[PDB]
């Protein structure tokens, strides 16, 4: 089997992407944030604290003839932006772009943090990291991908995120019309539960490539590109007037600037992030100070190849027995 779904930026900045997901019988369609940085499928629901819901579409398991409460099971998660949620668990039928999993753990939120409430466009998360990170207790649950894996034509999914435009998530096949050149594959460590790999280096604009090992994760649930401070400093030094602002909480730059590109290495291959992809707009409405899309990972404890990096590529998440990651230009 296969599936294919369009993923759509939630706003003009591409702060995140949403993908429609069918849950239950008859289908209830919710727009979820596909997150290769986490391993829980969770939704706003009829169980969510009333005051914590503001515009989201909710899953109502009582209206689904295939929902079953997973007895005694609970879940609780936190993300890198400091947001969190928690609740109980149902099993139900979940379909993504024509690919159906029966018996999928659907984590029903009872509680969500303010950032989730405040974003009306995201109806929950669909985690695509390794199931070892799944938070359900006392019986850990598998991800959608893990459950669909053996049924897929090939045990893979691909992320093709657009810049200020819709993209695609495919399951079980690689669309060879969706990228240019070849896909370069690279080793993955699953020891922290993430799609963790090692970039071979970087370049700033038309500058010389610096060969250096940069360990980090491929994370569709993180908007920006978080890299070591040395790297980030080298980038922003090429932007007149750019500065790290402790008050704003990262590098800012004059909105009048034209930003240089940023290149990252994948083995001997190179992925080029255009300058405009690194512009995240005014720090506040009407401001002429803009927020940068490359930021320091100092203090995170891990480097993160977020949407700013992944959207410049066609990315293969190869869930073979030994997982790997593939990157192609497009
Ligand atoms: O936390 C993540 C993945 C992530 C961040 N998110 C923010 C909002 C909504 C979804 C979401 N997913 N990645 C990460 C961050 C820090 C350290 C390790 C992994």
Distance N to C terminus: 25 Å
Bound molecules: 2-(imidazo[1,2-a]pyridin-2-yl)-N-phenylacetamide
Here the CATH topology of the largest domain equals Cathepsin D, subunit A, domain 1
Question: Structural class of the secondary structure composition?
Answer: mainly beta
User: Which architecture of the largest domain would the CATH scheme give at its second level?
Assistant: Beta Barrel
| Rg calc | 20 Å
Total strands: the figure is 24
* Number of helical stretches of at least 4 residues: 4
Strand order of the largest sheet: 18-17-12-13-22-14-21
Overall outline: globular
Report the sheet-strand fraction. 35-45%
Per CATH, the class of the largest domain reads Mainly Beta
**Helix percent band:** under 10%
The ordered H/E elements are EEEEEEEHEHEEEEEEHEEEEEEEEHEE
Q: How many independent structural domains?
A: 2
CATH superfamily of the largest domain: Acid Proteases
Protein described:
- The structure is a monomer.
- Helices cover 6% and strands 44% of the residues.
- With 330 residues, the protein is mostly beta strands.
- The chain has two domains: 5-174, Cathepsin D, subunit A, domain 1 (Beta Barrel), CATH 2.40.70; 175-330, Acid Proteases (Cathepsin D, subunit A, domain 1).
- The strands form three sheets. It has a seven-stranded mixed β-sheet with strand order 18-17-12-13-22-14-21.
- β19 and β20 (289-292) form a beta hairpin.
- It starts with a strand and ends with a strand.
- Bound molecules: 2-(imidazo[1,2-a]pyridin-2-yl)-N-phenylacetamide.
- It catalyses: Hydrolysis of proteins with specificity similar to that of pepsin A, prefers hydrophobic residues at P1 and P1', but does not cleave 14-Ala-|-Leu-15 in the B chain of insulin or Z-Glu-Tyr. Clots milk.
- Keywords: Aspartyl protease, Disulfide bond, Hydrolase, Protease, Signal, Zymogen.
- Residues 17-328 form the Peptidase A1 domain.
């Amino acid at each position: 089997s296969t599936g294919s779904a369009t993923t759509t930026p939630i706003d003009s900045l591409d702060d995140a992407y949403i993908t429609p997901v069918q849950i239950g019988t008859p289908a209830q369609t919710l727009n979820l944030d596909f997150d290769t940085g986490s391993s829980d499928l969770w939704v706003f629901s009829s169980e969510t604290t009333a005051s914590e819901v503001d515009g989201q579409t909710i899953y109502t398991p009582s209206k689904s003839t295939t929902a079953k409460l997973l007895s005694g099971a609970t879940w609780s998660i936190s993300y890198g932006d400091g947001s969190s949620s928690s609740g109980d668990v149902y099993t139900d039928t979940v379909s993504v772009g024509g690919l159906t999993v029966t018996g999928q753990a659907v984590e029903s939120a009872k509680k969500v943090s303010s950032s989730f409430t405040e974003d009306s466009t995201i109806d929950g998360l669909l985690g695509l990291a390794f199931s070892t990170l799944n938070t359900v207790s006392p019986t850990q649950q598998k991800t959608f991908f893990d459950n669909a894996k053996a049924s897929l034509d090939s045990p893979v999914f691909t992320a093709d995120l657009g810049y200020h435009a819709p993209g695609t998530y495919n399951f079980g096949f690689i669309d060879t019309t969706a990228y240019t050149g070849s896909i370069t594959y690279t080793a993955v460590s699953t020891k922290q539960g993430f799609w963790e790999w090692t970039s071979t280096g970087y370049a700033v604009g038309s500058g010389t490539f610096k060969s250096t090992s940069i360990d980090g994760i491929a994370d569709t649930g993180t908007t920006l590109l978080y890299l070591p401070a040395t790297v980030v400093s080298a980038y922003w030094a090429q932007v007149s007037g750019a500065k790290s602002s402790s008050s704003v909480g990262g590098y800012v730059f004059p909105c009048s600037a034209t930003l240089p590109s940023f290149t990252f290495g994948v083995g001997s291959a190179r992925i080029v992030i255009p300058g405009d992809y690194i512009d995240f707009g005014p720090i506040s409405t009407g401001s002429s100070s803009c927020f940068g899309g490359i930021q320091s990972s100092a203090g995170i404890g891990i480097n993160i190849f977020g949407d700013v990096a992944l959207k410049a590529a066609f990315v293969v998440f190869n869930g073979a027995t030994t997982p790997t990651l593939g990157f192609a230009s497009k």
